[PDB]
Amino acid sequence: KLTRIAIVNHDKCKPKKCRQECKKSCPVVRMGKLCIEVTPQSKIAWISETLCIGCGICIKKCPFGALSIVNLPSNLEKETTHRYCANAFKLHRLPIPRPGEVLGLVGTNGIGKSTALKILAGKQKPNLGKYDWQEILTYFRGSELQNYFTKILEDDLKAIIKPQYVDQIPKAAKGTVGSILDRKDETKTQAIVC
Amino acid sequence: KSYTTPKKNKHKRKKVKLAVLKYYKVDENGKISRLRRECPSFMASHFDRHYCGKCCLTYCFN
Amino acid sequence: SAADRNVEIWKIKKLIKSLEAARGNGTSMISLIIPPKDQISRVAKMLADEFGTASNIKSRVNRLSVLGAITSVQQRLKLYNKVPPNGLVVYCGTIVTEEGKEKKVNIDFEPFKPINTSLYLCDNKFHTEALTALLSDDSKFGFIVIDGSGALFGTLQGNTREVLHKFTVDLPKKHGRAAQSALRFARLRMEKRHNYVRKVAETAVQLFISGDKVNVAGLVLAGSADFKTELSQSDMFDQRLQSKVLKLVDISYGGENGFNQAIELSTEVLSNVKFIQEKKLIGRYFDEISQDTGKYCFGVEDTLKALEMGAVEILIVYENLDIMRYVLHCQGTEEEKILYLTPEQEKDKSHFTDKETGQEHELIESMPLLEWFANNYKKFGATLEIVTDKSQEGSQFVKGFGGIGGILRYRVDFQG
RNA sequence: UCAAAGUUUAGG
RNA sequence: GGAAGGGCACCACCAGGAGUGGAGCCUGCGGCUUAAUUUGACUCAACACGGGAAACCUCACCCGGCCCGGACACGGACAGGAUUGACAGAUUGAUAGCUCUUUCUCGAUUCCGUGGGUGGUGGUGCAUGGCCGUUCUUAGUUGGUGGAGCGAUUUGUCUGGUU
RNA sequence: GUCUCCGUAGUGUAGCGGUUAUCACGUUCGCCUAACACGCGAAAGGUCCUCGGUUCGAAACCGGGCGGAAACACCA
Numbered sequence: 001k002l003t004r005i006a007i008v009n010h011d012k013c014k015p016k017k018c019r020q021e022c023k024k025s026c027p028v029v030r031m032g033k034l035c036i037e038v039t040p041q042s043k044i045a046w047i048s049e050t051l052c053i054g055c056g057i058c059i060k061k062c063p064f065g066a067l068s069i070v071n072l073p074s075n076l077e078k079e080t081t082h083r084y085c086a087n088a089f090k091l092h093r094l095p096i097p098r099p100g101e102v103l104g105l106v107g108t109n110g111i112g113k114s115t116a117l118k119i120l121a122g123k124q125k126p127n128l129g130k131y132d133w134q135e136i137l138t139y140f141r142g143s144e145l146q147n148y149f150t151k152i153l154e155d156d157l158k159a160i161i162k163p164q165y166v167d168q169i170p171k172a173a174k175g176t177v178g179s180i181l182d183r184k185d186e187t188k189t190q191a192i193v194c
Numbered sequence: 195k196s197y198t199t200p201k202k203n204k205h206k207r208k209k210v211k212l213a214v215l216k217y218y219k220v221d222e223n224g225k226i227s228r229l230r231r232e233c234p235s236f237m238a239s240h241f242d243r244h245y246c247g248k249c250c251l252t253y254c255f256n
Numbered sequence: 257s258a259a260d261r262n263v264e265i266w267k268i269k270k271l272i273k274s275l276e277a278a279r280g281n282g283t284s285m286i287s288l289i290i291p292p293k294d295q296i297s298r299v300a301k302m303l304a305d306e307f308g309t310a311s312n313i314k315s316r317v318n319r320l321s322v323l324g325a326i327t328s329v330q331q332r333l334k335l336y337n338k339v340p341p342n343g344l345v346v347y348c349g350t351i352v353t354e355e356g357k358e359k360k361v362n363i364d365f366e367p368f369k370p371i372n373t374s375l376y377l378c379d380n381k382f383h384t385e386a387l388t389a390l391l392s393d394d395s396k397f398g399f400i401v402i403d404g405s406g407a408l409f410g411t412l413q414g415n416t417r418e419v420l421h422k423f424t425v426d427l428p429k430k431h432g433r434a435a436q437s438a439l440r441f442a443r444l445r446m447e448k449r450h451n452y453v454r455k456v457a458e459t460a461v462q463l464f465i466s467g468d469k470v471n472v473a474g475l476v477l478a479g480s481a482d483f484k485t486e487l488s489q490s491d492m493f494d495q496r497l498q499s500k501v502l503k504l505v506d507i508s509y510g511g512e513n514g515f516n517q518a519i520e521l522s523t524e525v526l527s528n529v530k531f532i533q534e535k536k537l538i539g540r541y542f543d544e545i546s547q548d549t550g551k552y553c554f555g556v557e558d559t560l561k562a563l564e565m566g567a568v569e570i571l572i573v574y575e576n577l578d579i580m581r582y583v584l585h586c587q588g589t590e591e592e593k594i595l596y597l598t599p600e601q602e603k604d605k606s607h608f609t610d611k612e613t614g615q616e617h618e619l620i621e622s623m624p625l626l627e628w629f630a631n632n633y634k635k636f637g638a639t640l641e642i643v644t645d646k647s648q649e650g651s652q653f654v655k656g657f658g659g660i661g662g663i664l665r666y667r668v669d670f671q672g
Numbered sequence: 673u674c675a676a677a678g679u680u681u682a683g684g
Numbered sequence: 685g686g687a688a689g690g691g692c693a694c695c696a697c698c699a700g701g702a703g704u705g706g707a708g709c710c711u712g713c714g715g716c717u718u719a720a721u722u723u724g725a726c727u728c729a730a731c732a733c734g735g736g737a738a739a740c741c742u743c744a745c746c747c748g749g750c751c752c753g754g755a756c757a758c759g760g761a762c763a764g765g766a767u768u769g770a771c772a773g774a775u776u777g778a779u780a781g782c783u784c785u786u787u788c789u790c791g792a793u794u795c796c797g798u799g800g801g802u803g804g805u806g807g808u809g810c811a812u813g814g815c816c817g818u819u820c821u822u823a824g825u826u827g828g829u830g831g832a833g834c835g836a837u838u839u840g841u842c843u844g845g846u847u
Numbered sequence: 848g849u850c851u852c853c854g855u856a857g858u859g860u861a862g863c864g865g866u867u868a869u870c871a872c873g874u875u876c877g878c879c880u881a882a883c884a885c886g887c888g889a890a891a892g893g894u895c896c897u898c899g900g901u902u903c904g905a906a907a908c909c910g911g912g913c914g915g916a917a918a919c920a921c922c923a
């Protein structure tokens with residue numbers, strides 16, 4: 001029980017400079033099947049992970065090093081919460097938020113950590129591997145996400161995020177430290193927090 | 195029905211009726227001159243022979 | 257000679273192909289096969305009863321064609337006085353074909369290799385499943401059969417069960433009824449017993465080797481009392497012979513009555529050798545893809561071009577591949593081109609108009625590529641290695657890589 | 673006023 | 685039915701004859717052989733049978749070649765003559781104008797589709813008809829009405845004698 | 848190793864120095880039968896294991912070759 005995941009790094013993948021390459025090196029496409037699709041024009045070199053073998057020929061060939069084929073357990077295919085595009089990142093779960101209980105996320109970055117927080121914040125809709133809210137709640141039943149998402153979708157819960165990049169905030173807001181806290185007062189708890 | 199390569203078909207003929215055919219010339223408008231020689235019993239100008247086109251008579255001056 | 261054998265094999269391969277295509281009416285054909293030990297009189301008796309029973313076939317067309325077919329084979333068998341070695345394979349009938357040409361046919365031949373298969377059949381078509389099944393499995397295995405009584409050596413094609421050599425020995429007793437001499441006689445007994453293993457190992461080098469490289473793709477020891485174990489692991493046993501020891505069989509009985517017991521036990525392991533050689537080769541092919549290297553090829557567009565040029569060293573092929581070599585021809589200008597096409601690109605294809613001149617470019621009939629590879633790999637680079645889709649590495653090679661590839665003589669660049 | 677005499681396409 | 689009563693036939697026997705089987709050849713068939721050795725029929729009821737004694741023809745078989753005898757229509761093809769039919773000489777087996785170079789010609793024939801025919805000693809006698817042969821050369825076979833049986837059936841069409 | 852014996856048409860065996868090498872089966876060919884079987888009538892087939900010797904003459908008698916098969920191998 002194992003399956004491949006095709007990935008293309010869109011920052012590096014330029015179809016125009018390299019020509020095709022992947023197509024010319026693929027034993028699926030040299031046979032003659034729709035495994036890899038690029039054309040001279042059109043951005044992002046598409047792959048099907050179904051038709052792909054997982055031989056790692058195309059990854060070695062691509063001149064920028066745009067591609068990657070990593071294997072995942074076939075157990076996880078059932079449990080997708082978010083995959084943004086084909087040949088892209090594929091999150092499989094969300095944490096299980098509890099009310100009045102500080103949720104501790106821990107694990108290395110680039111493993112769907114920001115996507116999870118954005119989904120829980122309610123910016124992103126769980127596309128759930130499709131790429132719809134009753135269908136999403138039904139997917140997340142018997143679990144605290146349906147409790148969490150119901151709450152989100154009628155009672156508009158206020159999504160606020162302490163950001164990762166702290167050095168980007170100074171070049172946006174202006175004035176004194178005391179002035180900004182006075183402007184954002186809702187609780188009126190300046191002093192005790194200070 | 196395996197037809198052999200070197201034997202092949204044998205194409206039948208194709209005629210060439212090269213427009214209207216001429217056997218006469220105009221001498222002094224009124225009179226006429228005859229080009230080709232005629233049957234005794236237009237017999238053609240074969241490269242050496244003189245072959246008929248009906249009664250199958252033939253001639254050649256040596 | 258070796259070349260004359262290969263021509264005789266190809267002759268029979270061609271003949272076999274023409275007989276499977278034959279086709280005929282009801283059950284007018286005969287497929288008959290005779291093993292080498294068999295008597296012809298017994299076969300001629302069998303046909304005489306089959307002739308008698310055929311006399312009461314109700315339908316006309318079938319009946320009269322059968323009887324005449326049975327009479328022909330009876331007369332062919334009168335010419336031989338014995339069934340030759342390698343058996344006999346008699347193929348009678350009255351085949352239908354183009355031009356409405358219901359023609360009588362008879363092909364008796366002693367085949368190359370010995371055949372251990374009997375078969376009587378009548379049918380609408382001929383049945384060469386025995387012959388083609390033989391032609392695939394040329395793989396010989398050896399059988400050394402040790403016993404305290406005496407040894408035996410023999411070989412084993414997919415069908416045929418041979419005896420090469422055997423001897424019997426006057427071995428000593430187990431015990432010595434003196435106290436002092438017990439030990440000396442026991443050493444003496446063990447030295448006689450070792451000399452016997454040596455002789456068997458020597459005779460085994462005599463028989464199974466050929467030009468300092470053994471003919472048998474394997475070798476089996478079969479015995480009891482840990483006597484095969486004495487031979488197998490001994491330094492006496494030559495390592496070129498020892499490295500092909502696949503089974504050490506435990507058998508009741510000894511000699512030729514133990515032989516066929518040893519074969520029955522050794523079946524799965526002797527079948528698996530082809531599967532193991534497949535894995536080893538495609539495993540060697542796949543390592544070049546796993547690394548950078550670049551001493552590989554794949555696809556008829558590439559693999560053939562590689563073979564044409566700076567040639568391959570090994571040319572891996574899947575049996576089933578179905579890709580075929582057509583010869584396209586022009587009506588007027590007499591221009592031609594050959595291409596290697598897939599099952600859908602060969603069956604119907606509007607590509608083949610001449611275009612430049614402006615005519616219909618007729619695709620004159622094919623032959624299909626596994627056969628083409630075999631025809632002239634000798635005039636290229638060679639080692640045409642047929643593989644199956646059974647192994648995990650083979651399955652990838654068939655399903656993924658299109659069942660065609662090769663291990664090259666050096667690094668090669670490719671473009672487009 | 674008692675010898676021996678077995679068998680019978682898969683091919684409709 | 686290697687059950688029993690009767691009664692019969694030289695395609696049964698008896699008593700005999702003439703024989704065939706043995707020899708040579710004539711001829712039919714099966715096989716092998718071949719380019720092809722065309723084929724049908726294999727117990728009586730296949731095999732001096734097909735009326736079958738083939739030099740040619742017959743003739744299907746084989747290997748070579750010409751010819752259309754391709755109706756009629758619908759059309760296309762209609763004349764810058766559609767495109768039937770031609771001594772050479774090379775070739776050819778041929779004195780087949782079959783083909784290549786050339787003649788010139790019926791002059792409304794043609795060529796191409798399609799529909800569609802036509803022909804067929806091609807296949808199927810297990811698709812049939814007719815015609816023969818055989819069971820079967822013996823004495824056998826049938827319904828109406830009546831009677832017997834639920835009925836299939838039987839009775840009539842029979843113990844006996846006689847032919 | 849010893850001593851012993853046996854190597855005969857396809858199979859199993861006879862064979863008293865002068866034989867067409869005996870018998871049975873098997874084989875082919877007729878017939879019988881619708882066919883087969885049985886049955887009837889015919890036919891063909893031996894390197895007499897191998898070589899050398901003795902002999903007027905050897906399948907045999909004698910020698911050695913190559914095979915095959917029994918009995919012995921005990922007292923410590």
Ligand SMILES: Nc1ncnc2c1ncn2[C@@H]1O[C@H](COP(=O)(O)OP(=O)(O)O)[C@@H](O)[C@H]1O
Binds near residue numbers: 112114116
């Ligand atoms: N809007 C987008 N469209 C296409 N690709 C994206 C987008 N956002 C992110 N990606 C790709 O997905 C990868 C991981 O992003 P993401 O999953 O958001 O980060 P994290 O794993 O930290 O949550 C990036 O390398 C990027 O190339």
Ligand code: SF4
Binds near residue numbers: 025026059
């Ligand atoms: S991985 Fe090997 S197979 Fe799958 S696409 Fe890239 S190349 Fe073709």
Ligand code: SF4
Binds near residue numbers: 023
């Ligand atoms: S993948 Fe690397 S190579 Fe294939 S197209 Fe996109 S960029 Fe060019």
Ligand SMILES: [Zn+2]
Binds near residue numbers: 234235246248249250
């Ligand atoms: Zn004239």
